[PDB]
């Protein structure tokens, strides 16, 4: 999901 970029990791 983009949670996963969400603080970039």
Same mark, same amino acid.
């Given at each position: 999901?983009? &949670? !996963?970029? &969400?603080? !970039?990791?």
């Amino acid at each position: 999901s983009v &949670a !996963g970029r &969400a603080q !970039g990791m």
